[PDB]
Design an enzyme around this catalytic site. Structure first.
Site, PDB file in Angstrom:
ATOM      1  N   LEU A  44      12.274   6.889   7.873  1.00 27.23           N
ATOM      2  CA  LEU A  44      11.086   7.724   7.992  1.00 27.23           C
ATOM      3  C   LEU A  44      10.604   7.754   9.442  1.00 27.23           C
ATOM      4  O   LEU A  44      10.451   6.713  10.079  1.00 27.23           O
ATOM      5  CB  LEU A  44       9.946   7.229   7.094  1.00 27.23           C
ATOM      6  CG  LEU A  44       8.561   7.831   7.354  1.00 27.23           C
ATOM      7  CD1 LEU A  44       8.483   9.256   6.819  1.00 27.23           C
ATOM      8  CD2 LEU A  44       7.452   6.957   6.773  1.00 27.23           C
ATOM      9  N   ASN A  95       9.421  -1.078  10.035  1.00 28.87           N
ATOM     10  CA  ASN A  95       9.422  -0.905  11.481  1.00 28.87           C
ATOM     11  C   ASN A  95      10.043  -1.981  12.306  1.00 28.87           C
ATOM     12  O   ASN A  95       9.817  -3.024  11.768  1.00 28.87           O
ATOM     13  CB  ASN A  95       7.991  -0.590  11.967  1.00 28.87           C
ATOM     14  CG  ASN A  95       7.688   0.891  11.784  1.00 28.87           C
ATOM     15  OD1 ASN A  95       6.737   1.257  11.078  1.00 28.87           O
ATOM     16  ND2 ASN A  95       8.479   1.764  12.387  1.00 28.87           N
ATOM     17  N   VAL A 142      11.723   2.413   5.725  1.00 29.77           N
ATOM     18  CA  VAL A 142      10.398   2.602   6.319  1.00 29.77           C
ATOM     19  C   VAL A 142      10.047   1.473   7.274  1.00 29.77           C
ATOM     20  O   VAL A 142       9.402   1.660   8.307  1.00 29.77           O
ATOM     21  CB  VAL A 142       9.323   2.712   5.216  1.00 29.77           C
ATOM     22  CG1 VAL A 142       7.989   3.136   5.795  1.00 29.77           C
ATOM     23  CG2 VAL A 142       9.757   3.681   4.115  1.00 29.77           C
ATOM     24  N   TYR A 172      16.026  -8.835  -7.616  1.00 24.16           N
ATOM     25  CA  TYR A 172      16.860  -7.870  -6.913  1.00 24.16           C
ATOM     26  C   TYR A 172      17.859  -7.122  -7.774  1.00 24.16           C
ATOM     27  O   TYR A 172      18.141  -5.970  -7.413  1.00 24.16           O
ATOM     28  CB  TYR A 172      17.639  -8.487  -5.737  1.00 24.16           C
ATOM     29  CG  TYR A 172      16.792  -8.633  -4.495  1.00 24.16           C
ATOM     30  CD1 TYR A 172      16.367  -7.516  -3.784  1.00 24.16           C
ATOM     31  CD2 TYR A 172      16.403  -9.891  -4.051  1.00 24.16           C
ATOM     32  CE1 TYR A 172      15.581  -7.655  -2.650  1.00 24.16           C
ATOM     33  CE2 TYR A 172      15.623 -10.034  -2.924  1.00 24.16           C
ATOM     34  CZ  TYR A 172      15.208  -8.912  -2.236  1.00 24.16           C
ATOM     35  OH  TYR A 172      14.424  -9.058  -1.118  1.00 24.16           O
ATOM     36  N   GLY A 192       8.876  -6.080   4.531  1.00 22.93           N
ATOM     37  CA  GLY A 192       9.053  -6.631   5.874  1.00 22.93           C
ATOM     38  C   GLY A 192       7.741  -7.171   6.457  1.00 22.93           C
ATOM     39  O   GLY A 192       6.648  -6.834   5.998  1.00 22.93           O
ATOM     40  N   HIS A 228      10.731   6.989  16.064  1.00 21.72           N
ATOM     41  CA  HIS A 228       9.394   6.800  15.523  1.00 21.72           C
ATOM     42  C   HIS A 228       8.720   5.857  16.519  1.00 21.72           C
ATOM     43  O   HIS A 228       9.459   5.274  17.335  1.00 21.72           O
ATOM     44  CB  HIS A 228       9.466   6.170  14.130  1.00 21.72           C
ATOM     45  CG  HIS A 228       8.162   6.151  13.397  1.00 21.72           C
ATOM     46  ND1 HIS A 228       7.735   5.087  12.631  1.00 21.72           N
ATOM     47  CD2 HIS A 228       7.174   7.069  13.329  1.00 21.72           C
ATOM     48  CE1 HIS A 228       6.545   5.363  12.126  1.00 21.72           C
ATOM     49  NE2 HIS A 228       6.178   6.552  12.537  1.00 21.72           N
ATOM     50  N   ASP A 260       8.958  -6.346  -5.512  1.00 20.79           N
ATOM     51  CA  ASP A 260       8.366  -7.138  -4.467  1.00 20.79           C
ATOM     52  C   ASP A 260       8.714  -8.610  -4.694  1.00 20.79           C
ATOM     53  O   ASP A 260       9.039  -9.026  -5.807  1.00 20.79           O
ATOM     54  CB  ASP A 260       6.846  -6.970  -4.379  1.00 20.79           C
ATOM     55  CG  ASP A 260       6.347  -7.182  -2.953  1.00 20.79           C
ATOM     56  OD1 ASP A 260       6.353  -8.352  -2.501  1.00 20.79           O
ATOM     57  OD2 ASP A 260       5.961  -6.185  -2.310  1.00 20.79           O
ATOM     58  N   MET A 265       0.798  -1.222   0.000  1.00 16.91           N
ATOM     59  CA  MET A 265       0.000   0.000   0.000  1.00 16.91           C
ATOM     60  C   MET A 265       0.827   1.266   0.000  1.00 16.91           C
ATOM     61  O   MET A 265       0.571   2.197  -0.778  1.00 16.91           O
ATOM     62  CB  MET A 265      -0.972  -0.029   1.193  1.00 16.91           C
ATOM     63  CG  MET A 265      -1.911  -1.229   1.126  1.00 16.91           C
ATOM     64  SD  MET A 265      -2.806  -1.287  -0.459  1.00 16.91           S
ATOM     65  CE  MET A 265      -4.345  -0.553   0.092  1.00 16.91           C
ATOM     66  N   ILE A 266       1.865   1.320   0.840  1.00 14.05           N
ATOM     67  CA  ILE A 266       2.722   2.516   0.833  1.00 14.05           C
ATOM     68  C   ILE A 266       3.441   2.576  -0.513  1.00 14.05           C
ATOM     69  O   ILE A 266       3.461   3.620  -1.163  1.00 14.05           O
ATOM     70  CB  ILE A 266       3.720   2.553   1.996  1.00 14.05           C
ATOM     71  CG1 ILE A 266       2.956   2.647   3.325  1.00 14.05           C
ATOM     72  CG2 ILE A 266       4.700   3.714   1.842  1.00 14.05           C
ATOM     73  CD1 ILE A 266       3.844   2.501   4.544  1.00 14.05           C
TER      74      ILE A 266
END
Lengths: 304, 304, 304, 304
Positions: free
Chosen positions: D138, D115, D113, D65, D79, D170, D33, D12-13
């Protein structure tokens, strides 16, 4: 002051439209949906991009039809998606939405996306009571974006520099007009004569244009970005009074020998909605194809 | 990193170009001129608009030719403006500028504006030694902007939606191709058949297009905004690799039966400069007119 | 539909404003001036950039005050420019313009540029009869653009990322507030503590900010691009209802201990004109400076 | 020529980032992906918006890749998302991605990005071998967008006009600095003194900022639009050399008494990557909070 844009349906297309409206600072946005709270979540997320985009558009969710009150622009993507079986069910959704448009925002400019779009647009026109110049359906802007893009990549020119016309209807019976394709304003036949592109390549590009949604779904994705940007190009032409020539589904009153039905044709979109309906001077062969598109529209209209 | 854009000549066109580059965040700008300090004053003024425009382009003045060093793009407007008398004098300016381009920025992409542009562009091409795909002259983007604008106002459609071709040369012998005018990608003849516009109106629009600079000067003004925006559209197509189809003065190598001379024709502008030279398939009547434009160019070339 | 923007005065600032309005597609433009036909010439030139900019704004000239009828926004740059001698003459111009605003477009949002702006704005407010939230003068957006730009170049950060406040009045008595300067939202004192910038550099930057117009004129140029972009930032904040915090000349009703006079202070500009007047909590030393600016305004007001 | 932007992760991002890059014409895009063909479907859809956006960015999918080769910018969202359990698994993904960055595009500018971002960014920095100024995470742009937006709605001002700092990390231990909030460059305390906003409202806004992702998920949505626009603001600052002051996760070398760890702080992003690391002069109370954020980062680093 700012325009109020109500998005009836807050799915994937709805989400990208809201994103693009804030990017372009088009107006306040209402993400409406029957699903509880989801539109609120998407709206909240989307509202923060005002900071990054230097804009000031309110973005809110809604689970209530009366939030249509004051709408300047209403974009309908809501609906179920034995495809024929869904016709009556989606007709029921257009009915309900149309009653609220008549009651809450009779002067809004309406853009219908729900498929079969040429059918659903006319249904909503009938149930909402809006003037024929204030309701259109998405079709040709989206369909020609693929055609124009594919040709621009073969020719190595800027995508917008290719112009093309796809009429009659959205969907598998769309009418691609080879004769009306230009590249930098120059007839495409010149590029075919020069061997820069062949007829056989163009034949493959036409089939790919017609089957693009199927191609995206076979690749394990779903078309929602292009559709959303095409819808916003149309909405922006209305709001900013650009008077852009855009191919949309609109009420035919005699053009192409057809009446009392909606079909795709180039229209001019400005502050007065559909300001002009442009009838292409098709030959008998293009006309025959146009007829087939209209007949399929009528066939599905009769089952709703 | 950022592109370096050197504007050789910091007059009215130079000032608007600098303004537009910061508006669009195109790159650092050098306003060069032979006049002492003036380019510094304009640059200083223009540098403050970075705040209002959210951009970060350095804008500086220069009274030194070696500031061309590192130029990615060079835009020449410098020159005197018995018009034939000025030919040799402006040739001298192209010589001097061309020697500095060869020495300081041989890989720059060059846009010549100085009139007669089709003459001056070839002169600078010869004195600078740059490849033929790296030097163009302003003409058709500016000339067709008037033609496209005037027709869009008669037809009540968005100005960009009208596309038209003006070839051969910039100036009074420009060749307007009625056959290559489209409206939303649709041949203009359809709109003439429908009586939306007449041939007689189009005849007046053609004369007005040809005489627009004279019309502006008779109104006690001077054309510099449109020219500047047209130059920036061309420069931006190069820098951003847009590959837009833009009509510019470029070296003809056989197209239209013409060689060893610069003339206006649709070209594709991208990261490789002139990536493509598009030859319109003109008829004998349009060709004859094209010949007249080239002959006038040759006539003035012979006096420089 | 589209906003109608009347530019009363079609000089250099007027020309750049018209250019920027079409670039940003802000609305139809009227270039008005007392000089015969010149505004028509500039308008014509500027109208062609609609093609290059993908916009649809009408640009026309006018030599008649009733073309103010229907104005949504009116920007006044008209006026003569023993400076004290010009006060009454420019007051006469504000009178004449004010009578036409009251008669033709009483609901327009007015931006005054004519110098001394803090004087001329109040005069026009009085002669036009418009509400106090519908008339402002250009000052702080322009003055702080220089201050913000100069500091951003020393600090090597994006120009917009520096924020600063200059209040009281436009002109030589402008009040620069060192305490209210930030860099990326961080107090400037932190950067001074870190030795990234010194107090002595900042002192030179302040004097340069105050004398920027003089510096441009000593360089054989004249400030018109920055002023025009600052005016358009203000006009755009009104038209698009951005609610940007912009420092402008506005009616003081007690703020800073001052009443019945116009002075520069941060205001919020949105669809309701001046929606908020922000009073900075100045100390006695900044206040004293603010008083001096207001006194000079009063002194010149008394001679008009 | 054009920048090549590889998006490692096409969820989605990833989809919104690709959309925004074409909207802004930032460069060619690769949607990478591990999922077969999906990135191809999204890329195809997104490629058609070039027509509507007037841009020319190639958009393609990739399941390989080595398509990282030539990358100017690499944005990692890939991730898994007992949260502690995922640490080692996501570390494995950073390892694999880092080996390909070192081999294929060692000079790329990297934005992480995934987490916990302050952890994952340092891991990828270590496995990829890129210079410390060429990799950021981010955090603060996204977190402060909520804080800035919420305050702007209470104060009725343009969202961008509110500036705020959130540092340390974050996630739930983010450090909100009340002292560093400004409105139009004016300290927020002034607005609290004036009763335009209260401390109690600001306390609620702080908790809402910290819990925004949770609030969106409780509303049956997921945050992806704001994150994507914040990532693109950062990427655009690098590519266009804007030198914007943006709060990102970056290597701390002594700032705040911390070393050998990544943490959120205002940085300057330009053509040289992280050009400047700005250390806020926090008091002991803000420092204590900063320490807690770093300790949580270290705690999770120790489990990867």
């Amino acid at each position: 002051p700012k325009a109020k844009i109500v998005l009836v349906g807050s799915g994937m297309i709805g989400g990208v439209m809201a994103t693009l409206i804030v990017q372009k600072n088009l107006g306040d946005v209402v993400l409406f949906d029957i699903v509880k709270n989801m539109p609120h979540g998407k709206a909240l997320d989307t509202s923060h991009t005002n900071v990054m985009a230097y804009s000031n558009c309110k973005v809110s969710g809604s689970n209530t039809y009366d939030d249509l009150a004051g709408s300047d622009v209403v974009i309908v993507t809501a609906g179920f998606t034995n495809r024929d079986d869904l016709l009556p069910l989606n007709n029921k959704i257009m009915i309900e939405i149309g009653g609220h448009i008549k009651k809450n925002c009779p002067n809004a400019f309406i853009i219908v996306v729900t498929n079969p779009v040429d059918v659903m647009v006319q249904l909503l026109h009938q149930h909402s009571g809006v003037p024929k110049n204030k309701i259109i359906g998405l079709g040709g802007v989206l369909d020609t974006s693929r055609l124009k893009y594919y040709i621009s990549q073969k020719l190595n020119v800027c995508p917008r520099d290719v112009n093309a016309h796809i009429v009659g209807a959205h969907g598998n019976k769309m009418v691609l007009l080879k004769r009306y394709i230009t590249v930098g304003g120059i007839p495409l036949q010149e590029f075919i004569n020069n061997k820069l592109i062949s007829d056989a390549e163009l034949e493959a590009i036409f089939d790919r244009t017609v089957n693009t949604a199927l191609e995206i779904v076979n690749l394990h994705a779903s078309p929602y970005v292009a559709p959303a940007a095409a819808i916003i190009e149309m909405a922006e032409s209305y709001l900013k009074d650009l008077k852009k020539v855009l191919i949309c589904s609109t009420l035919l009153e005699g053009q192409y020998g057809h009446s009392d039905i909606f079909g795709g044709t180039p229209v001019v979109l400005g502050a007065n909605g559909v300001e002009q309906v442009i009838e292409l001077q098709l030959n008998s062969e293009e006309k025959a194809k146009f007829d087939e598109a209209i007949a399929e529209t009528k066939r599905m209209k009769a089952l709703a």
